[PDB]
Amino acid sequence: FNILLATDSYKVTHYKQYPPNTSKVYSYFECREYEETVFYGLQYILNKYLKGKVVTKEKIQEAKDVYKEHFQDDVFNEKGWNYILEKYDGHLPIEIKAVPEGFVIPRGNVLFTVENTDPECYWLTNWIETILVQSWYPITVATNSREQKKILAKYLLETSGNLDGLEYKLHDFGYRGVSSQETAGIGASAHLVNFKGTDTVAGLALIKKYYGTKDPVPGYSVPAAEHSTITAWGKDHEKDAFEHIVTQFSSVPVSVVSDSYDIYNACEKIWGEDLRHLIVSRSTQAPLIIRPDSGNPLDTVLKVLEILGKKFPVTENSKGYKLLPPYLRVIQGDGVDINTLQEIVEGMKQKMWSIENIAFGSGGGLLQKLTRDLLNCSFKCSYVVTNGLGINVFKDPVADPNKRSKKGRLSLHRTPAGNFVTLEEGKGDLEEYGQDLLHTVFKNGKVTKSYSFDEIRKNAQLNI
Amino acid sequence: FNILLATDSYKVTHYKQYPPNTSKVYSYFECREYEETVFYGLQYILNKYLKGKVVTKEKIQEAKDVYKEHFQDDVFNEKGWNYILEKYDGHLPIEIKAVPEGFVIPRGNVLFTVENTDPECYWLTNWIETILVQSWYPITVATNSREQKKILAKYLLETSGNLDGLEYKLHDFGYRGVSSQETAGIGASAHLVNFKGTDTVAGLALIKKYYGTKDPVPGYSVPAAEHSTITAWGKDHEKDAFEHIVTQFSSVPVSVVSDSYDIYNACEKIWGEDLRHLIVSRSTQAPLIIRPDSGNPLDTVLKVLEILGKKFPVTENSKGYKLLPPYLRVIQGDGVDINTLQEIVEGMKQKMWSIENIAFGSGGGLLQKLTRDLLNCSFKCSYVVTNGLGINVFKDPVADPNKRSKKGRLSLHRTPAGNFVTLEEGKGDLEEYGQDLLHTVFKNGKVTKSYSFDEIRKNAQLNI
Numbered sequence: 001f002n003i004l005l006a007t008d009s010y011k012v013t014h015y016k017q018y019p020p021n022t023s024k025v026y027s028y029f030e031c032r033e034y035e036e037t038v039f040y041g042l043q044y045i046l047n048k049y050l051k052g053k054v055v056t057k058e059k060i061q062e063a064k065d066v067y068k069e070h071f072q073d074d075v076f077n078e079k080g081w082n083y084i085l086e087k088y089d090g091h092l093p094i095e096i097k098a099v100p101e102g103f104v105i106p107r108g109n110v111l112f113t114v115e116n117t118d119p120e121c122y123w124l125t126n127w128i129e130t131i132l133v134q135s136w137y138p139i140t141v142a143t144n145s146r147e148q149k150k151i152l153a154k155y156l157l158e159t160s161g162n163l164d165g166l167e168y169k170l171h172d173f174g175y176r177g178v179s180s181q182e183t184a185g186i187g188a189s190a191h192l193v194n195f196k197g198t199d200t201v202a203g204l205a206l207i208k209k210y211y212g213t214k215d216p217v218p219g220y221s222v223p224a225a226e227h228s229t230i231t232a233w234g235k236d237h238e239k240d241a242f243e244h245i246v247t248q249f250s251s252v253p254v255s256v257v258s259d260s261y262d263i264y265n266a267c268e269k270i271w272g273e274d275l276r277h278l279i280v281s282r283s284t285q286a287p288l289i290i291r292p293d294s295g296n297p298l299d300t301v302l303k304v305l306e307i308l309g310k311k312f313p314v315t316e317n318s319k320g321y322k323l324l325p326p327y328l329r330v331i332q333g334d335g336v337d338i339n340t341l342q343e344i345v346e347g348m349k350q351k352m353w354s355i356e357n358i359a360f361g362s363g364g365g366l367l368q369k370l371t372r373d374l375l376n377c378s379f380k381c382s383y384v385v386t387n388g389l390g391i392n393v394f395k396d397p398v399a400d401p402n403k404r405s406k407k408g409r410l411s412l413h414r415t416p417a418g419n420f421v422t423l424e425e426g427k428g429d430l431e432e433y434g435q436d437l438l439h440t441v442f443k444n445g446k447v448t449k450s451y452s453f454d455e456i457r458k459n460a461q462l463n464i
Numbered sequence: 465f466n467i468l469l470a471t472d473s474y475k476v477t478h479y480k481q482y483p484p485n486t487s488k489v490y491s492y493f494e495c496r497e498y499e500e501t502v503f504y505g506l507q508y509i510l511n512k513y514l515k516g517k518v519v520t521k522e523k524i525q526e527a528k529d530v531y532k533e534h535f536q537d538d539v540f541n542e543k544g545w546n547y548i549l550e551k552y553d554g555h556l557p558i559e560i561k562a563v564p565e566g567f568v569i570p571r572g573n574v575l576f577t578v579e580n581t582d583p584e585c586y587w588l589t590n591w592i593e594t595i596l597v598q599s600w601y602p603i604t605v606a607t608n609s610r611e612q613k614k615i616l617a618k619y620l621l622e623t624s625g626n627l628d629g630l631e632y633k634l635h636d637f638g639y640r641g642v643s644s645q646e647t648a649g650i651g652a653s654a655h656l657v658n659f660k661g662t663d664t665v666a667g668l669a670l671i672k673k674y675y676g677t678k679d680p681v682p683g684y685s686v687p688a689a690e691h692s693t694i695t696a697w698g699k700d701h702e703k704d705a706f707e708h709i710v711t712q713f714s715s716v717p718v719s720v721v722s723d724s725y726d727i728y729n730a731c732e733k734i735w736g737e738d739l740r741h742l743i744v745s746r747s748t749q750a751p752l753i754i755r756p757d758s759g760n761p762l763d764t765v766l767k768v769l770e771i772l773g774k775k776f777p778v779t780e781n782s783k784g785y786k787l788l789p790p791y792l793r794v795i796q797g798d799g800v801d802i803n804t805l806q807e808i809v810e811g812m813k814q815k816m817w818s819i820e821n822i823a824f825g826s827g828g829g830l831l832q833k834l835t836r837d838l839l840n841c842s843f844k845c846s847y848v849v850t851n852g853l854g855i856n857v858f859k860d861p862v863a864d865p866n867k868r869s870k871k872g873r874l875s876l877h878r879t880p881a882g883n884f885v886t887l888e889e890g891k892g893d894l895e896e897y898g899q900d901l902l903h904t905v906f907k908n909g910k911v912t913k914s915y916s917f918d919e920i921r922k923n924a925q926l927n928i
């Protein structure tokens with residue numbers, strides 16, 4: 001990895017575009033006015049890409065050669081990078097201040113600020129915009145995950161009277177459905193800010209390396225069939241496949257994909273009749289989890305539940321909602337995103353089914369179907385010093401007031417009612433609103449302030 | 465990077481789930497029935513992740529320990545993995561056959577197949593599903609980028625009578641808008657199958673390392689302002705910003721974001737009067753490229769063109785469409801995806817503006833707003849050998865015929881009319897349909913057939 005090659009091409013020329021005698025460029029990240037965002041993921045970037053000796057004589061030469069061909073010209077700022085190498089032993093002269101990770105913050109508030117700490121390196125702040133802006137992704141995954149947890153909590157409370165099991169109710173199965181290995185680890189770690197369940201091993205390793213937890217792992221999984229392990233038995237042997245699998249995993253929970261040929265038949269005749277004896281013997285600590293995986297997600301779930309309700313001993317919990325026996329559960333892993341999750345739980349509640357009966361798996365919906373537009377993640381310059389004079393800078397496009405950016409030096413504060421406000425134009429120096437909530441997390445090549453994953457989870461909790 | 469840790473967790477238990485006495489699991493990848501897809505990206509994954517000695521004792525222990533905590537149980541198949549270490553010096557006993565990269569293939573056809581080459585390794589075919597299915601992403605980016613190129617081609621032809629500059633009409637600005645560094649490089653390279661322009665330099669490194677071109681670089685870029693380099697001058701000095709930049713880059717094309725404050729004023733009064741003299745003197749090889757970046761994408765483009773056509777000498781081309789002077793162009797980079805690109809060119813044609821006038825930048829729309837669902841990318845088992853008998857396996861969910869998978873051993877053929885057919889149930893052996901288009905690309909830890917990026921581009925060409 002070469003930081004000199006991890007920027008948008010066109011930023012290679014920007015050092016020639018600033019007003020002459022600019023000694024300072026100060027920029028900020030916000031999610032422009034999903035009402036509140038979880039701040040997560042910056043520390044990963046600081047550690048993996050930004051900290052330490054990131055410039056070498058070989059990296060300079062590599063970038064020189066690449067840009068010569070990419071531009072067919074010599075725009076590359078070889079001198080500026082040589083300066084950083086010689087003066088700072090390749091350590092970036094940059095200060096980054098940030099809200100603590102895990103913090104839940106309303107939209108349109110400053111989340112982090114970047115500035116150069118050497119006047120020669122005015123051009124550096126925005127060189128690193130590209131890399132730092134990728135934090136949109138773990139912010140957005142964490143926020144969307146947390147929004148889903150809010151929905152799950154509402155209906156579990158309504159239908160059961162408590163939140164037992166909540167943190168296992170939405171499980172990450174997005175490994176194959178993301179755009180890369182590196183994305184898999186980052187997104188899975190972001191989901192684990194809110195939940196405990198992941199099939200994406202790389203998330204755990206990222207957390208261990210970049211954040212740290214008290215546990216050996218933050219993420220968990222249970223044995224489960226896939227279509228290949230059922231259909232390999234042949235069409236006429238779906239029952240033999242079912243019986244082999246539940247018997248192989250008779251004392252731990254086991255998920256079994258049941259829609260290979262006919263989901264309604266598998267539930268009513270195979271699970272509900274031929275193999276019933278192997279289900280009702282099972283422990284509360286080791287349920288069979290029936291997995292539909294096709295058809296209309298709500299309609300399938302309701303019909304699966306009605307079928308099981310006629311074949312197995314259903315009870316009524318203290319809220320008046322129907323509850324399967326504890327050795328039997330359902331998981332819906334097909335077509336799950338925030339919208340369909342809401343429809344499924346509302347539709348279950350309407351038909352008097354406890355949210356205790358169900359859990360969810362999500363892949364693309366959880367980790368891939370998300371863009372920087374969802375939270376309007378944006379990084380803009382708000383303050384420059386030119387000729388020793390500091391000036392408040394901003395954009396304000398005529399045709400879109402939503403893209404208006406903030407002015408001057410920024411700080412984040414608690415209001416007297418305990419909400420958040422971002423003060424502009426250096427006004428946080430007036431001290432009418434207490435101390436700035438941003439901390440310096442990076443300075444001159446060093447990470448200066450850090451958070452364990454446990455602090456992060458704590459910060460990201462629902463009100464409850 | 466540990467391949468034993470690069471699967472969905474639940475797959476760890478699948479060696480216990482297949483029928484006893486199974487010696488072969490054969491699986492295939494298709495984009496289930498955007499009617500034709502560009503097959504691109506597998507060769508990256510083969511080289512980075514799959515080839516050579518991928519198993520070591522250290523990797524085995526690491527996996528063993530992680531899995532003990534994740535599952536809170538001993539389910540990891542140490543014996544299977546140790547067998548591969550000792551018998552094959554850690555090389556994967558797997559054969560993969562694939563259609564050549566760059567091939568454009570209709571929906572619902574086999575694109576690659578995977579099988580174990582040693583009966584002891586039956587479980588390995590689907591171990592590596594997760595990592596292989598990640599090919600959905602470069603497949604999908606290349607396909608969606610080619611589809612935008614068809615739209616571009618159509619309207620450029622209709623409005624100008626040729627395709628000059630087509631390969632430069634859609635520029636990749638998606639670096640900051642993707643989910644990670646790795647995605648950035650994979651996505652940029654997939655876009656370069658169809659176009660020449662990227663600001664994501666990692667795409668170029670990937671292509672050189674994994675595919676190779678006779679070109680010194682496969683992608684190119686031009687000097688461009690951002691809001692920071694314009695707004696830094698202060699609100700009253702937009703004109704000085706503009707002036708400084710076009711003078712810095714007088715002899716090459718230069719793109720200037722013009723909507724910081726009021727794009728309509730910038731075009732009419734700043735470019736159109738104040739700085740008109742610095743524009744009209746410019747070379748055809750070095751235009752000013754005006755960049756709007758807000759408002760309704762179509763409306764803003766049209767109004768920008770209306771303003772400019774009143775301040776600058778418009779001609780009418782041989783097809784009757786209006787054309788700005790060669791020193792003056794426009795680039796829309798805001799809000800651009802396949803849908804809006806189509807609306808803009810059609811809006812332009814309706815108002816009698818040539819598509820020669822415009823180029824497009826796309827970020828999230830190009831590299832991030834895509835999922836596995838768009839082309840229904842799917843990997844499924846179609847054939848097993850159990851007790852020395854081959855059986856044809858498939859799924860066929862009652863409620864969703866779109867999810868029916870293919871049966872038996874598969875091959876891809878040219879039809880007599882020159883289309884594609886996938887033969888099922890090993891019927892390709894009857895040899896009624898000429899050569900199987902799938903070629904072995906991986907066998908037993910070695911990459912066996914490679915494509916340069918040059919063949920890939922040639923294979924992915926438009927009809928025209």
Ligand SMILES: Nc1ncnc2c1ncn2[C@@H]1O[C@H](COP(=O)(O)CP(=O)(O)O)[C@@H](O)[C@H]1O
Nearest residue numbers: 173174224255333334361362363364474842843
């Ligand atoms: N064991 C499991 N439990 C719950 N959901 C699962 C699951 N295995 C797979 N899924 C669901 O199915 C997705 C993976 O898609 P598949 O490759 O199994 C089916 P298809 O996309 O080929 O039609 C996951 O992202 C998840 O939503």
Ligand SMILES: Nc1ncnc2c1ncn2[C@@H]1O[C@H](COP(=O)(O)CP(=O)(O)O)[C@@H](O)[C@H]1O
Nearest residue numbers: 010378379637638641688797798825826827828
């Ligand atoms: N030089 C340029 N030419 C064309 N489009 C550009 C561009 N620079 C940025 N863009 C467009 O804007 C996207 C980057 O978003 P920005 O951070 O510049 C504005 P915002 O996202 O904060 O509202 C790029 O992916 C691209 O579509």
